[PDB]
Design an enzyme around this catalytic site. Structure first.
Site, short mmCIF file in Angstrom:
data_model
loop_
_atom_site.label_atom_id
_atom_site.label_comp_id
_atom_site.label_asym_id
_atom_site.label_seq_id
_atom_site.Cartn_x
_atom_site.Cartn_y
_atom_site.Cartn_z
N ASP A 1 39.70 -17.39 27.27
CA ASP A 1 38.62 -17.00 26.38
C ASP A 1 38.96 -15.66 25.71
O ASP A 1 40.05 -15.11 25.90
CB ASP A 1 37.28 -16.95 27.13
CG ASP A 1 37.24 -15.85 28.17
OD1 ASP A 1 38.05 -15.88 29.10
OD2 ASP A 1 36.36 -14.97 28.06
C1 LIG Z 1 33.35 3.85 31.28
C2 LIG Z 1 32.66 4.62 30.15
C3 LIG Z 1 31.59 3.83 29.37
C4 LIG Z 1 31.27 2.41 29.91
C5 LIG Z 1 29.87 1.85 29.54
C6 LIG Z 1 29.85 0.46 28.83
C7 LIG Z 1 28.59 -0.42 29.10
C8 LIG Z 1 28.77 -1.97 28.98
C9 LIG Z 1 28.08 -2.81 30.10
C10 LIG Z 1 28.10 -4.36 29.94
C11 LIG Z 1 28.18 -4.91 28.50
C12 LIG Z 1 27.33 -6.16 28.22
O1 LIG Z 1 26.43 -6.48 28.96
S1 LIG Z 1 27.70 -7.16 26.72
C13 LIG Z 1 26.24 -8.16 26.09
C14 LIG Z 1 26.65 -9.11 24.93
N1 LIG Z 1 26.04 -10.46 24.92
C15 LIG Z 1 26.71 -11.60 24.45
O2 LIG Z 1 27.85 -11.47 24.03
C16 LIG Z 1 26.02 -12.96 24.47
C17 LIG Z 1 26.68 -14.08 23.63
N2 LIG Z 1 28.08 -14.35 24.01
C18 LIG Z 1 29.15 -14.25 23.09
O3 LIG Z 1 28.85 -13.94 21.94
C19 LIG Z 1 30.62 -14.55 23.52
O4 LIG Z 1 30.46 -15.39 24.61
C20 LIG Z 1 31.47 -13.30 23.97
C21 LIG Z 1 30.82 -12.56 25.13
C22 LIG Z 1 31.61 -12.39 22.77
C23 LIG Z 1 32.93 -13.78 24.43
O5 LIG Z 1 33.37 -14.67 23.56
P1 LIG Z 1 35.05 -15.42 23.64
O6 LIG Z 1 34.98 -16.13 24.97
O7 LIG Z 1 34.99 -16.27 22.40
O8 LIG Z 1 35.96 -14.22 23.59
#
Ligand SMILES: CCCCCCCCCCCC(=O)SCCNC(=O)CCNC(=O)[C@H](O)C(C)(C)COP(=O)(O)O
Ligand SMILES: CCCCCCCCCCCCCCCCCC(=O)OC[C@H](COP(=O)([O-])OCC(O)COP(=O)([O-])OC[C@@H](COC(=O)CCCCCCCCCCCCCCCCC)OC(=O)CCCCCCCCCCCCCCCCC)OC(=O)CCCCCCCCCCCCCCCCC
Ligand SMILES: CCCCCCCCCCCCCCCCC[C@@H](O)O[C@H](CO[C@H](O)CCCCCCCCCCCCCCC)COP(=O)(O)OCC[N+](C)(C)C
Ligand SMILES: CCCCCCCC/C=C\CCCCCCCC(=O)OC[C@H](COP(=O)(O)OCCN)OC(=O)CCCCCCC/C=C\CCCCCCCC
Ligand SMILES: CCCCCCCC/C=C\CCCCCCCC(=O)O[C@H](COC(=O)CCCCCCC/C=C/CCCCCCCC)COP(=O)(O)OCCN
Lengths: 62, 111, 124, 459, 175, 220, 88, 67, 178, 128, 52
Positions: free
Chosen positions: G43
């Site tokens: 993915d």
């Molecule tokens: C260390 C210093 C800073 C750190 C802090 C950072 C904080 C982040 C914590 C967690 C982040 C989230 O929850 S991220 C929340 C985002 N939500 C979604 O993405 C829902 C829909 N899904 C999609 O669009 C695709 O499945 C996709 C995921 C793009 C993959 O796709 P491929 O399979 O086509 O690559």
């Protein structure tokens, strides 16, 4: 040709500077001024032959 | 005459010779950095001698060699102070510069 | 040190002022004080060109140390006894200054006790 | 003094009777020879001036200016022949004639014994400069520039003329020696105040003083290269020289009449240095730098001390050389790319290394690096100003900072970074351009070995 | 050397101590000094001897120019341009000579300060006093004259100072 | 001068202990040492300040060349977070930087000792600003702190650099220059200290805890 | 001197070396032409991690707009070769 | 001395660099131990620090509070 | 740098770029490799927790608080590759990059050295000169009347054509020109 | 949840913290498309001259010409005497002059009346 | 806040300095009256130091 560097970069420059200081710079007053040498008790002066007496018989706290 | 003044001025003067040769053929060759480093090492070795004279007898001097200009009552002359600070710092600086130029011959090889 | 704690946190009126001391006469508690003597004359120190802060009551030892350093120039490890003698004389001078500090603070505490207690017996 | 004037006059029939392909060679060679001859005026006396005749005299103030003028003519000829190649033979000869007439007027101006003759030559220098700017300038603004160059000068100089003749009615003479020996104090009156203003404001406009300086950016930007060189190197100094001559009759009035001009000079020196930090045109930056340096010269002349006069003389000579060099440096790139925008052509050190070295040395002399005569003059003026009032250092030091900040800024903008990709017509430097830069820079450095030769009468 | 006058530029008798070695170790300063002598000073001395031999075969002289004393600005009439001119030239020469006198005294002071080392504050008192006196006299003569100084302005300054001194003395005689 | 030096040395030492570029850490070290020079000027010890200049030149230049050798070996990488275990991979560089860091922290009988040890004693034994003295002692501790940071992150642990290992310090120019300044950083203090006339009155009498203060704050 | 000049074979070998140390990839069926999505069943997060691993391998980072479309080992090898001026 | 890269392996070392590094580390440690054996006071101080409380009133010149 | 940007970034692209930035800053915080691997697996799990969310409003707000958390918790001094835009060697070799047209201004004595190089250079110049008009014609043919919409360029499509606007891409100075 | 970052003039708001990039409407997408189209048309116009083999000289940029003209020659024709401009000009042009005049005049009055009293310590002050 | 705190604490440390429990340093010849500028013709007030 082994030591040609030390004769043209050291010996020649020190010939010119020593000639320049000895016969031109020191031909005018106060151009080269040295602080007078330190004199200690018991020393003998080269210029006049004078002898400085010693220093007052310490209590000798040994 | 006292060798002190001549040696102190020669140590400084010989550092300018490669600057005069910067327009010569050696500047276009790959031997120029080695030539500069060797000049600095020779200058350090020469400057070691006034340091010994000072450590022996505490010799200090001022050399007003060239009169630049007189402004009514203020005379401006090229004058060098050769006290403890100068005669002690010059060999230290030359030693460090010699090491750093030798290091630069390797660090900046592809420049 | 603890003297700073006493002066700053305790009663400063009982503590010596380093800038303004001594305030009591030098012959106050002593019956007879011998004046501190000097070995090296003014001319000897002037000819040695020591420094205006090195021309203290320990200057003769410094003069011998300088002469010994100049005489055995190549052997810079030969002026040990002279260096030790000069250091010892400076240490004795510092001990005298500490004694003066302690004397003046003791005198000032005794002065406060006597004055305010003769007042205490004088108020009744 | 005629041994300088007559060869300069002979330059005219020589260029008008030369072959079509020989005008530049002949003019350059003979102007260089005239400069060599004029170099003999540097032997000055101390006590008094060299009084050749009733009409002309030479001083330790006049002689460096004369040598600078005679030296600037060959450099202007060298810098002009590139962009005047397509010109016809007659118009090239007319351009050279304008330059020769300007030199003749300046040479007579710097040596006139009598103030009306000085004034007449001082105004006569206007006409060739106006013709040069408005006939051989490149843009449409040149015409407007010419008008600004003209009426700023005349609006200042017409009162001076009146004052001058008024003086000759009461003193009986305008000969400078008589004026100096028979000088009398000015009383505190309204008539004396206005006569002081009439005597000063023309030279103020010529400097130019901050607030009367708007003609200078226009005139220097719109002029051809030789016009800019002569306008910055010599013409501005006509003010300073004039002031140094006329303040001998203005005491003790100058003791308080100088306050507004001192305030204007110090604050506007700060202002023009700051203006240089945000300038899109490369020639405009050089013009404003000239304004700032001349403000410092105004302060020096107004405080009326031997150290200030010496500093003003040295700074005038040094700035003339440095500003001429900077204008030539900018013109080389302009002829490369036909634009004066400073950010258009970048990273030029990669493409033109020796010209980059010339740029660096010119920038160093502009910010008064020791032991250049630029800093000699600046430091003398600053020391005299500190004696005048200790708070002046606050402004003076500030100026120093800003000066460096814009100088290197120019250097960093045009020489460093990466080259502009689409500009592909940057040819190697010609021998003519390199020689012109060298002939600017080497005399400036050699003057360090003998500074007294430019330190003026007060030395 | 004898090139300059020792009365105008004095120096103390230059006492130096005799070497008093206290160790058996060789002194590197003396060995390097002998090497320097033999390899630097002898060739330089020979070259100078040759140059002086050449100079001796061609000996010519130059002279110091002597200026007469002309009347000063005090006895010049108000509009007599020639007497005023000569008086002004004489005054300019006197000003230059006074500047060089101050220069000589300052040279004495500087050389004293360097020569005395750590004892300069006490051992250069005479030079400091001489410079103070010369500096005060020079300041009285020439300060505040301005950019276009002249013998007339100096005369006016002296007359103002004389008037102030006379008034001070007159009011001191009343107290 | 004393107050300016004190605030400078403590502020720059405080900045140094969190930096990740090795050149930046050594530059903040240089600033802190210059602040120490200014404080020893402020307590009226100019000869001691000059002595510190001469001593610090040796080991600070050597520390910079050690950093440069590390950077050149790791394909012009300057971040300590990507420098792993170089203790065994660059043995001569490790030795030189260890000796230089020991000289910088005032380890006894090294070049930095004869200078730094005396400066701390003179500040402790003078009529001085109390805040300035406290700041100087804290900066003395922070010096050992950032020296520890450099050594621990650049030479200890496991590698953190890219897998193509180009480590090579076997060049006579590098080795000889480092060796020369290393002998300097070891012996110049003793030689220069014993070969100059005494320009100061020495502090011969002080409480023992005040005598050992510089070593104690360094240990901390 | 400095590092030896880089070659296409070295770049390909190192890219395949890094990919074979990834647990989500079968070492034996992995080819230079294998699509990360269609053939290897990964993915977008796995692609991001692969790009980051390549950046760590070669000591330089690939911008996101370029990195998004490197979907097979040959594409990564070609991108690195074009970036570092490798022709053989 | 020609040294090659190794790709995820410990680099090749020469004997000269190892022996020189060890020699100079040992030189530093020997110098420190030698100087401390001969010049220990430079760390530990040579003169005892007096206690002002152990000083009698007679030798400091304090009268017994009744004068 | 080599790819033409689009008008906007999709949600998927934004999420991936946030993932990469968060992992890089975590590596900056977690210096050591084993600790970084542990916390990067934790980050990947926390990131996968919402991989299959359907309500795009919820996914967008999740992305918003993820960005807010990153901005609060980012490393103030993150690791930068030496030749990256914030790196210590970013534009270090730019002063050694000389455009190829400068070679046309060399003195004939300078070109007397390197004869074969300049023969090949003349061959390249002939190629560019002979291909220019076909490149222009292809660009005119393939461009919609309302002007180009993106910065993408077409390839060559005939037997002996070259991709339009290729000269300055092909004749880049170098990355290490000296 | 976490402390909030607030932007300033010299420390602007990051794109990832900008709500405008998360509230997307069809008009926003079409505006972004128009911006990309304008950029692409300009890019093609530039690249057709940049890669031209027969082009020698400078590719004149109308945007640079407009910028320099607006910064220099367009200013006075668009100036209108306004209370805001009048006060700003009066202040920034005249206030510093009287400020410095007052400072220098006060300093020199003090120094002069202190010279008159004979208490300035002018010893060794012979150069000026 | 850092800069203001440092300035305030430096002022406080000036008000409450650090020193050692010693008296003034003593110098032999009327506190070196002739060495520190001289004027040997005005009979300086005698500074006498005693043993303790
Ligand atoms: C260390 C210093 C800073 C750190 C802090 C950072 C904080 C982040 C914590 C967690 C982040 C989230 O929850 S991220 C929340 C985002 N939500 C979604 O993405 C829902 C829909 N899904 C999609 O669009 C695709 O499945 C996709 C995921 C793009 C993959 O796709 P491929 O399979 O086509 O690559
Ligand atoms: C101090 C050292 C003393 C050395 C002794 C001998 C010196 C001889 C120099 C003679 C004068 C130089 C001529 C000026 C134009 C340059 C000509 C040229 O094109 O060069 C091409 C030539 C050929 O090289 P290339 O490979 O073919 O291509 C060159 C490229 O263009 C690319 O070239 P580049 O990138 O390599 O740059 C060329 C070079 C040349 O460009 C320059 O910038 C040099 C000009 C100096 C600055 C000038 C303005 C600043 C004000 C200072 C005024 C000084 C005047 C003193 C009297 C001068 C007399 C003429 O620039 C530099 O290298 C860096 C300049 C930084 C120097 C900063 C100086 C500060 C003060 C130093 C002391 C000054 C007083 C000394 C006494 C004080 C008390 C003891 O290159 C050189 O030969 C280098 C020039 C030599 C460097 C001089 C640096 C110091 C000298 C200053 C004046 C000398 C004073 C002598 C008195 C005794 C001491
Ligand atoms: C853009 C830059 C252009 C150049 C600027 C040149 C600056 C020239 C300014 C001249 C400076 C001073 C001029 C005259 C000296 C004093 C002026 C006056 O203000 O002082 C008072 C004068 O008193 C009153 O103020 C009268 C003056 C007021 C009337 C004049 C109008 C001033 C308004 C400002 C007009 C703007 C001038 C510039 C126009 C462009 C002093 O009082 P008092 O000591 O008893 O009288 C002295 C004169 N005596 C001895 C002959 C009797
Ligand atoms: C080249 C190799 C030459 C080999 C043969 C020469 C051997 C010795 C030659 C001796 C020549 C005779 C001689 O120089 O006598 C002194 C003679 C004249 O006496 P003045 O001091 O100038 O009198 C006052 C006038 N201002 O001085 C000289 O001509 C030589 C001066 C050279 C000085 C050394 C270089 C320093 C100058 C560098 C320029 C720096 C710019 C300004 C610096 C400002 C400093 C405050
Ligand atoms: C770039 C713009 C520069 C503008 C410069 C304008 C200012 C020039 C200075 C004034 C010009 C005319 C002055 C006349 C020359 C003075 C000679 C003189 O001494 O005559 C006065 C007479 O003085 C005058 O009459 C002058 C009065 C002003 C007349 C014109 C007014 C113009 C505006 C005045 C202010 C502007 C001047 C300063 C402007 C500064 C620059 C902006 C005394 O003569 P008597 O009649 O015999 O009296 C003796 C007994 N007391």
């Amino acid at each position: 040709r082994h030591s040609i560097f030390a004769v043209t970069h050291v010996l020649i420059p020190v010939w010119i500077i020593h000639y320049y200081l000895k016969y031109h710079v020191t031909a005018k007053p106060y151009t080269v001024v040295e602080r007078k040498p330190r004199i200690f008790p018991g020393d003998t002066i080269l210029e006049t032959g004078e002898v400085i007496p010693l220093m007052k018989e310490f209590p000798d706290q040994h | 005459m006292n060798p002190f003044a001549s040696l102190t001025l020669t140590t400084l003067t010989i550092l300018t010779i490669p600057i005069m040769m910067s327009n010569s053929n050696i500047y276009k060759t790959n031997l120029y950095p080695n030539y500069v480093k060797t000049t600095v090492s020779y200058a350090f070795t020469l400057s070691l001698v006034p340091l010994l004279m000072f450590m022996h007898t505490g010799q200090e001097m001022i050399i007003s060699n060239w009169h630049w200009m007189t402004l009514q009552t203020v005379e401006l002359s090229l004058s060098f102070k050769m006290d403890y600070f100068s005669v002690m710092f010059i060999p230290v600086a030359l030693f460090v510069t010699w090491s750093i130029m030798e290091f630069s011959m390797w660090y900046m090889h592809s420049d | 040190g603890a003297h700073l704690a006493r002066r700053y946190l305790g009663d400063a009126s009982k503590e010596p002022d380093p800038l303004r001391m001594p305030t009591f006469p030098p012959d106050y508690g002593f019956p007879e004080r011998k004046e501190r003597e000097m070995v090296a004359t003014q001319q000897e120190m002037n000819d040695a060109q020591l420094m205006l802060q090195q021309r203290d009551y320990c200057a003769h030892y410094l003069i011998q140390l300088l002469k010994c350093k100049r005489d055995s120039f190549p052997n810079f490890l030969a002026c040990k006894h002279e260096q030790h003698d000069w250091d010892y004389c400076e240490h004795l001078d510092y001990v005298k200054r500490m004694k003066e500090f302690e004397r003046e603070r003791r005198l000032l505490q005794r002065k406060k006790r006597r004055e305010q207690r003769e007042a205490e017996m004088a108020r009744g | 003094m005629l041994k300088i004037i007559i060869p300069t006059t002979m330059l005219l029939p020589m260029t008008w009777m030369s072959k079509h392909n020989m005008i530049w060679i002949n003019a350059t060679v003979h102007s260089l020879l005239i400069s060599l001859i004029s170099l003999s005026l540097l032997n000055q006396l101390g006590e008094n001036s060299l009084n050749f005749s009733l009409t002309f005299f030479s001083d330790s103030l006049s002689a460096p200016l004369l040598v600078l003028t005679t030296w600037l003519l060959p450099l202007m000829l060298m810098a002009s022949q590139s962009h005047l190649s397509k010109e016809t033979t007659t118009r090239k000869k007319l351009y050279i004639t304008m330059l020769i007439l300007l030199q003749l007027f300046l040479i007579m101006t710097f040596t006139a014994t009598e103030l009306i003759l000085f004034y007449i030559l001082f105004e006569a220098t206007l006409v060739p400069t106006l013709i040069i700017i408005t006939r051989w300038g490149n843009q449409t603004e040149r015409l407007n520039a010419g008008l600004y160059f003209l009426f700023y000068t005349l609006a200042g100089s017409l009162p001076l003329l009146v004052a001058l003749v008024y003086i000759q009615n009461t003193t009986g003479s305008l000969n400078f020696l008589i004026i100096h020996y028979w000088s009398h104090p000015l009383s505190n009156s309204w008539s004396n105040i206005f006569m002081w203003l009439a005597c000063i404001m023309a030279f103020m406009v010529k400097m130019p003083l901050y607030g009367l300086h708007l003609w200078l950016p226009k005139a220097h930007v719109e002029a051809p290269i030789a016009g800019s060189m002569v306008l910055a190197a010599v013409l501005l100094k006509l003010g300073g020289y004039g002031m140094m001559r006329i303040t001998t009759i203005l005491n003790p009035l100058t003791n308080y009449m100088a306050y507004p001009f001192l305030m204007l000079s110090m604050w506007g020196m700060i202002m023009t240095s700051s203006i240089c930090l945000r300038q899109t045109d490369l020639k405009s930056l050089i013009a404003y730098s000239s304004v700032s340096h001349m403000a410092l010269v105004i302060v020096a002349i107004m405080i009326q001390t031997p150290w200030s006069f010496m500093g003003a003389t040295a700074l005038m000579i040094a700035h003339g050389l440095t500003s001429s060099m900077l204008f030539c440096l900018a013109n080389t790139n302009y002829e490369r790319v036909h634009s004066r925008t400073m950010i258009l052509a970048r990273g030029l050190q990669t493409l033109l290394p020796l010209m980059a070295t010339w740029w660096l040395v010119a920038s160093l002399t502009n910010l008064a690096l020791p032991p250049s005569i630029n800093l000699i003059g600046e430091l003398f003026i600053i020391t005299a100003s500190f004696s005048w009032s200790n708070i002046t250092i606050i402004l003076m030091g500030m100026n120093m900072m800003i000066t460096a900040l814009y100088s290197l800024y120019m250097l960093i903008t045009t020489q460093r970074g990466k080259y502009t990709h689409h500009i592909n017509n940057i040819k190697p430097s010609f021998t003519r351009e390199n020689a012109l830069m060298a002939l600017h820079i080497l005399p400036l450095l050699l003057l360090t070995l003998n500074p007294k030769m430019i330190l003026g009468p007060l030395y | 050397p004898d090139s300059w006058d020792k009365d105008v530029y004095p120096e103390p008798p230059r006492r130096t101590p005799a070497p008093a070695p206290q160790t058996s170790l060789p002194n590197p300063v003396t060995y390097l000094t002998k090497i320097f002598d033999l390899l630097v000073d002898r060739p330089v001395t020979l070259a100078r001897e040759f140059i002086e031999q050449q100079h001796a075969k061609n000996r010519y002289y130059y002279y110091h120019r002597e200026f007469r004393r002309v009347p000063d600005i005090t006895e010049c009439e108000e509009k007599d341009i020639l007497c005023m001119f000569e008086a002004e030239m004489q005054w300019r020469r006197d000003y230059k000579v006074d500047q060089e006198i101050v220069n000589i005294i300052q040279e004495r002071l500087k050389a004293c300060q360097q020569r005395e080392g750590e004892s300069y504050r006490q051992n250069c008192a005479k030079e400091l006093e001489q410079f103070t006196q010369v500096s005060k006299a020079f300041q009285d003569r020439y300060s505040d004259l301005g950019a276009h100084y002249s013998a007339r302005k100096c005369l006016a300054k002296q007359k103002q100072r004389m008037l102030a001194e006379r008034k001070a003395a007159k009011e001191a005689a009343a107290a | 001068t004393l107050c300016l030096g004190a605030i400078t040395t403590l502020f720059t030492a405080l900045c140094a202990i969190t930096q990740n570029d090795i050149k930046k850490i050594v530059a903040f070290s240089t600033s802190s040492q210059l602040g120490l020079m200014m404080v020893t000027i402020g307590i009226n010890q100019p000869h001691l300040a000059f002595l510190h200049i001469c001593m610090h030149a040796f080991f600070k230049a050597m520390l910079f060349m050690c950093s440069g050798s590390i950077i050149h070996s790791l394909n012009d990488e300057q971040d300590i977070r990507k420098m792993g275990g170089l203790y065994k991979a660059m043995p001569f560089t490790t030795t030189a930087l260890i000796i230089g860091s020991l000289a910088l922290t005032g380890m006894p009988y090294l070049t930095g000792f004869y200078s730094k040890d005396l400066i701390i004693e003179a500040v402790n034994m003078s009529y001085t600003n109390a805040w300035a003295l406290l700041m100087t002692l804290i900066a003395t501790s922070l010096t050992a702190a950032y020296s520890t940071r450099i050594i621990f992150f650049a030479f200890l642990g496991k590698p953190r650099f890219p897998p193509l290992v180009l480590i090579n310090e076997n060049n006579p120019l590098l080795i000889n220059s480092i060796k020369r300044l290393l002998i300097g950083s070891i012996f110049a203090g003793f030689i220069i200290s014993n070969n100059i006339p005494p320009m100061t009155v020495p502090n011969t009498t002080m409480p023992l805890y005040m005598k050992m203060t510089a070593l104690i704050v360094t240990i901390m | 001197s400095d590092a030896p000049p880089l070659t296409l074979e070295a770049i390909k070998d190192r890219v395949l070396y890094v990919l074979k140390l990834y647990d989500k990839i079968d070492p034996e069926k992995l080819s230079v032409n294998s699509h990360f999505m269609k053939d290897l069943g990964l993915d977008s997060l796995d692609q991001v991690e692969i790009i980051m691993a390549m950046e760590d391998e070669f000591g330089f980072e690939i911008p996101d707009i370029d990195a998004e479309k490197l979907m097979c080992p040959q594409e990564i090898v070609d991108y690195i070769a074009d970036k570092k001026d490798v022709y053989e | 001395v020609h040294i090659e890269p190794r790709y995820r392996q410990f680099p090749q070392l020469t004997r000269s660099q190892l022996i020189q590094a060890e020699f100079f580390s040992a030189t530093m440690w020997f110098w420190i131990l030698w100087r401390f054996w001969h010049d220990s006071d430079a760390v530990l101080g040579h003169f005892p620090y007096p206690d002002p409380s152990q000083w009698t009133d007679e030798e400091l010149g304090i009268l017994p509070d009744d004068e | 740098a080599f790819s033409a940007p689009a008008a906007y970034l999709t949600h998927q692209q934004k999420v991936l770029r946030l993932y990469k930035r968060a992992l890089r800053h975590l590596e900056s915080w977690c210096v050591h490799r084993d600790k970084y691997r542990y916390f990067a697996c934790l980050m990947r799990a926390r990131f996968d927790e919402h991989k299959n969310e359907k309500d795009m409003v919820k996914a967008t707000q999740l992305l918003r608080q993820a960005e807010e958390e990153f901005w609060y918790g980012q490393h103030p001094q993150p690791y930068i590759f030496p030749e990256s835009p914030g790196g210590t060697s970013y534009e270090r070799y730019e002063c050694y990059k000389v455009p190829e047209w400068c070679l046309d201004d060399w003195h004939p004595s300078e070109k007397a050295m390197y004869p074969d190089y300049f023969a090949k250079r003349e061959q390249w110049k002939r190629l560019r000169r002979e291909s220019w008009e076909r490149e222009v014609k292809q660009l005119q043919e393939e461009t919609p009347p309302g002007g180009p919409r993106t910065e993408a360029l077409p390839p060559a499509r005939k037997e002996g054509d070259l991709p339009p606007l290729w000269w300055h891409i092909v004749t880049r100075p170098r990355e290490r020109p000296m | 949840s976490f402390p909030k970052y607030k932007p300033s003039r010299l420390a602007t708001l990051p794109a990832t913290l900008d709500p405008a990039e998360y509230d997307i409407s069809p008009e926003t997408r079409k505006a972004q498309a128009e911006r990309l189209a304008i950029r692409s048309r300009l890019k093609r116009e530039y690249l057709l001259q940049y890669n031209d083999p027969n082009r020698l000289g400078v590719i004149e940029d109308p945007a640079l010409i407009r910028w320099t003209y607006a910064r220099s020659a367009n200013i006075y024709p668009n100036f209108r005497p306004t209370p805001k401009t009048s006060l700003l000009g009066a202040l920034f042009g005249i206030g510093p002059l009287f400020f410095w005049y007052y400072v220098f005049k006060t300093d020199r009055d003090k120094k002069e009346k202190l010279i008159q009293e004979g208490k300035l310590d002018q010893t060794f002050n012979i150069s000026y | 806040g850092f800069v203001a705190f440092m300035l305030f604490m430096f002022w406080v440390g000036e008000i409450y300095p650090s020193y050692q429990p010693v008296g003034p340093k003593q110098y032999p010849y009327n506190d070196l009256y002739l060495e520190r500028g001289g004027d040997p013709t005005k009979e300086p007030e005698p500074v006498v130091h005693y043993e303790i």
